[PDB]
Design a protein around this nucleic acid. Structure first.
Lengths: 363, 196
RNA sequence: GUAUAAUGGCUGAAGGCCUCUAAGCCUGAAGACCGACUGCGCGGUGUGUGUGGCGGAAGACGACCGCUGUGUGUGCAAGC
RNA sequence: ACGCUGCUUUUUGAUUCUUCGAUGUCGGCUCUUCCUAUCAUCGCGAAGCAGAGAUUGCGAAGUGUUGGAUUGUUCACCCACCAACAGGGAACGUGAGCUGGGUUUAGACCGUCGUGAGACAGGUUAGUUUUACCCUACUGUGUGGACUGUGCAGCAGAUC
RNA sequence: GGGCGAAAGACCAAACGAACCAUCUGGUAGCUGGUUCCCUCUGAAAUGUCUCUCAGGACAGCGGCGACGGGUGUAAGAUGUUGUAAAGCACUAAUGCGCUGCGUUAAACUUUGAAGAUGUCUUUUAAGUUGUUGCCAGUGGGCAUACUGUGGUAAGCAUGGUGUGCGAGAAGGGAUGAACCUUUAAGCGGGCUAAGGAGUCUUAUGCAAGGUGAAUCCGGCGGCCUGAUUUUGACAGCCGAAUUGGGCGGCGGAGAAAAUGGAAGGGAUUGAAUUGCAUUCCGAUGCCUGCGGGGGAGUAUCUGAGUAAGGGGGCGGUAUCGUUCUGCUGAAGGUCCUGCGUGAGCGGGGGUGGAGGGGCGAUAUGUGCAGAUCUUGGUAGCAGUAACAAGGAAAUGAUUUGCGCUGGACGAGG
RNA sequence: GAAGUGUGAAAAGGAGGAUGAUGAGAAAUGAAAGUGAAUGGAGUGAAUGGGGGAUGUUCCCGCCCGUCUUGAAACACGGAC
């Protein structure tokens, strides 16, 4: 009855039920806390996943601590981020039932990629603008803008249909938030005006899909011994006689992957443009940010990009949401990068810079 | 067939003694709305009321909590559930009686100049513990309710603009009074009275 | 992040003295509640969906993500 | 100490109310959940508490509590590690989940008992593990836009 | 009841520790299952004796149906019997001291001795109003409770005594329950109560006083009983007025630890879960009162629950003899609609059908179905599901090409 | 060691369908279980029943029969129609 040899349970109940996500662009669950003693800025951005590579880094300890300088090799992810466009304003007031949204201000000319997302692909078949601006100034506890991406600048996605979202505006004086966004309607805002190097960031996206999966893979339970009749990939006992029902905490077979996940404390390493040479490294060569042959199953990076440390949710060409940290951050160690690898990721590439391959063989 | 409507105000009212009387009105075909639902009180100490709400939260279907009992933390939703369990609500005569009830925190805007009533037996000053009680809004804010400062605001703004409307009305009662005591006034009205 | 348990304290009677307690107050836990994170119903709104075909990052079948002729073939690049 | 008063339902008895036109009877392996009468980890008292190491008490069930030799064993007993290697319930949890070593009809050997056919909770060896395609439960999936609010339900890091 | 066996009780035409086929044979069964229409009047036992008797039977007890026939299941006045409870030491058996008293006991001890039981006389005491006999059934596992014993650490344990219940007893109440409290049985009206209750589910009012599971400990109260101290200055540490020790009766707090989330019936309640009250009210199929129906009775009336079981009066199938009618101008059967009857059942109307069908009296019976792992026939759900097949191609296919391995003769059997 | 009788007075005639002919009549009668088509009403509650009222429901009451048994709605047995 009482069960000798205890062990931890297999998997977490924080994420049950494990359903598919209902959308490819999940909306953020919270926004940072407004400090109205700063200038006005934005708190997020949307980009697209390209691929992974190397970097070598010098661990600054050159004080006479027993290890002056170490080398450290770290994996990174590259995301391609063309500039976004602002086309609206939104305010929220406070009631006894919570946040109530006020009528919305549209700019002068809504793009053709914003109309396909709102009304489908076959959509083609004033002072009232000024009165609505006064409400967001009298009322409106908090303010947000409506932004959209420009997927037609990355012609390996094949979209023409934009992703749109609401992003909070931080910085004080609600009448100052509004007039900063009135002088920005129909114009672009770039990712270098939002995030900076050596900062911690959050990501939000959807994971790689796997379909219908067995229970050895979905939860990590043991296999049965080799003599066993009726198969070995399964759980042996799904409950006691009483209660005379199966519980929600038992492991079963079903959908694995394509879930909504939020990850936190990813460190930013570099911010550049794809149509120029990456540098700030301590070696001489030119080397744009894209490997020999290209990123596998992706084209080249020709717009702005951002580089962060480690793994990042999702598949190649899928959209991701970037958010500023909600926690307290201390400093960040000093970052010194001195080499970025750009060999071929198809096979075992041994050259950087195809001109270097051309001078090895001769002809 | 009935079409009567009553607005009930709960500010110093014992919550159980009000619920038992509001449910007998609903069964006899009267429409009720209870306003200021966060100001009803519970006789006793806050340590005794938190221990009783904590045992309520413990009740939970182990097999599948999505089928299980649902614990509401809003004052308007919680006091509506006390009235529901005063009666047999699974049967069709009880389903109809629950269609005649509305509950609010604070006072909504449409019910601004209409008269409110109190229940004569639920005043906390008739018990032996006047000055030892907890309001429904302080107890529930310690388990998750957020909008307690936005409810006191909305009620005072309506009270003040319901007091100004009383000053305009009272002064006209004095200007009309002098007209009734006039000279050309009476000799006129005595003519209309003359033709019966 | 807020309020607490055991314990330790402040002011203070009953009981002219005394006392952390009867009214009140300060502090305090891998615990409680809340936040953050995932899922579902219901609401609101200057807002209501490409019949078919073809693809995929999606998929047992339904569904989901895309376009509305830009495929196939061939050349170069990058690899075994 | 000598005496006296209780609680639990984990032992083994006592009883014979339910089931003999059948409720699959020991242990292990696998997997989930609950109790506190707390072993470790967090907070805090006492001392015949100098320090160090331990001993005794209170709040507290969130998270942990292992790898081997001999035995079918439960149990037991040793070796090594460890923050620590606590105790229990769920039809003595769990055989249309497995395995079948114990028990285990029909073959056989030994000891004791019987004139004999045969007997022994005495030892030994060889001995078929059937069927879901139904209802419910549970896991996904379907039940006809775009951007969001807010109620309910779940819930994660722990230790050296 | 024989065979055959390098032996396993193996094998002898898919069952072998005694094959198969027909008969005797509807073999016997103290054991299991089933046993067919309505209304109405009465109504049990689960105990004693004997039994190869113990899951059975006989005899006796309790009940039904009769028939015939004239004259006390309670008390009072008198007078007998008894050896328990309690108590006691007079006998039998026990038990401490002091050197005559004090102390402790008894199912198998009794000098005493109840309450209660039990005989007889007198209706020439009260109050009330049966004898003899015939033919026969079911039953012989009981159980609960108030009070009262015996065995057992104890038990929803086992076994006795007296009454009343369930059994064979509905209905109202106790949230729910065979047995608890009220009360004994659904016709149509009018009145009133019982148990239990009157915030809300849910029919229906108030007034008052306190308050906010064991040993073993702690506190309180305009409560009560008993003592002590004090204006000649107490108690506490000069001050100016009450201070204090033991107990008792209500009330509260420690002692107080279990396994899915959970229960004064629930939401709740500071008296809407405590105590004391009554001048109001609600509440049965019970009571009173007016009609209707049955059965008794000596004919102004009284009386209705019921298993096992027994008696009276009715409804329906098929025929005979014994009388009396109807059908081609459309019978029976079948289907829908409609009247009468407490009921078993009996009539009429419109389609369909295409040849016979009834009433009343006596008489003969293979005479009435929901059940028997009932017999035979037909039909559902499961379910368009499990299972099985879809063999390499070329518009055509006597042509081209791709794959597999049995191929050809005699006998038995067909 | 079974199961299986019936066009009509007359063949006066049919036998895939449709259009027709003959006949007094398309032709022994033709129940229940169960099903298809059309049309009226209701539903997301297991269903079904009694009282009281009504062109479905809303209030009250109501666990599945037969049997053995001290005792059955029974996690006692028999029972798809």
């Amino acid at each position: 009855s009482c069960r000798k040899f205890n062990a931890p349970r297999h998997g977490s109940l924080q994420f049950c039920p494990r359903k598919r996500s209902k959308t490819i662009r999940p909306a953020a669950g919270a926004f940072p806390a407004d400090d109205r003693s700063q200038p006005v800025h934005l708190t997020g951005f949307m980009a697209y996943k390209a691929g992974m590579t190397h970097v070598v880094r010098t661990k600054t300890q050159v004080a006479k601590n027993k290890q002056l300088s170490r080398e450290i090799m770290d994996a990174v992810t590259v995301l391609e981020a063309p500039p976004m466009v602002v086309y609206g304003i939104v305010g929220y007031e406070k009631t006894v039932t919570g946040l109530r949204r006020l009528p919305i201000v549209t700019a002068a000319y809504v793009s053709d990629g914003v109309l396909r997302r709102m009304f489908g692909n076959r959509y083609a078949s004033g002072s009232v603008c000024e009165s609505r601006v006064e409400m967001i100034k009298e009322r409106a506890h908090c303010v947000r803008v409506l932004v959209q991406t420009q997927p037609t600048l990355i012609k390996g996605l094949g979209l023409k249909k934009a992703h749109i979202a609401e992003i909070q505006v931080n910085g004080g004086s609600i009448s100052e938030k509004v007039e900063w966004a009135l002088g920005r309607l129909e114009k672009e805002i770039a990712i270098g005006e939002v995030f900076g190097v050596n900062e911690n960031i959050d990501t939000i996206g959807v994971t790689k899909g796997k379909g219908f999966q067995g229970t050895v893979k979905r939860f990590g339970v043991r296999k049965q011994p080799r003599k066993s009749r009726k198969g070995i990939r399964k759980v042996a006992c799904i409950g006691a006689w009483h209660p005379s029902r199966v519980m929600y905490s038992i492991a079963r077979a079903g959908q694995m992957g394509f879930h909504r996940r939020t990850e936190k404390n990813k460190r930013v390493y570099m911010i550049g443009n794809g149509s120029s040479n990456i540098k700030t490294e301590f070696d001489l060569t030119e080397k744009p940010i894209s490997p020999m042959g290209g990123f596998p199953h992706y084209g080249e990076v020709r717009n702005d990009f951002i580089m962060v440390k480690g793994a990042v949710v999702g598949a190649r060409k899928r959209v991701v949401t970037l958010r500023k940290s909600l926690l307290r951050q201390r400093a960040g160690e000093e970052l010194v990068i001195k080499f970025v690898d750009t060999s071929s990721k198809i096979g075992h590439g041994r050259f950087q810079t195809s001109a270097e391959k051309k001078a090895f063989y001769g002809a | 067939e009935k079409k009567e409507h009553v607005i009930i105000d709960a500010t110093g009212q014992v919550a159980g003694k009000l619920a038992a009387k509001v449910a007998k009105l609903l069964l006899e075909g009267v429409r009720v709305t209870v306003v200021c639902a966060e100001e009803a009180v519970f006789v006793g100490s806050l340590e005794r009321a938190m221990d009783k709400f904590k045992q309520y939260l413990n009740k939970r279907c182990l097999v599948n909590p999505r089928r299980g009992p649902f614990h509401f933390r809003e004052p308007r939703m919680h006091l509506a559930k006390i009235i529901r369990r005063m009666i047999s609500y699974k049967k069709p005569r009880g389903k109809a009686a629950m269609s005649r009830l509305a509950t609010y925190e604070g006072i909504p805007r449409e019910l601004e100049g209409q008269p409110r009533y109190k229940v004569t037996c639920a005043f906390v000053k008739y018990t032996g513990n006047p000055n030892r009680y907890v309001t429904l809004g302080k107890l529930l804010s310690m388990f998750g309710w957020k909008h307690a400062e936005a409810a006191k605001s909305l009620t005072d703004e309506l009270k003040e603009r319901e007091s100004l409307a009383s000053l305009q009305k009272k002064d006209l009662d004095k200007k009309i009074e002098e007209l009734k005591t006039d000279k050309n006034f009476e000799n006129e009205v005595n003519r209309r009275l003359a033709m019966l």
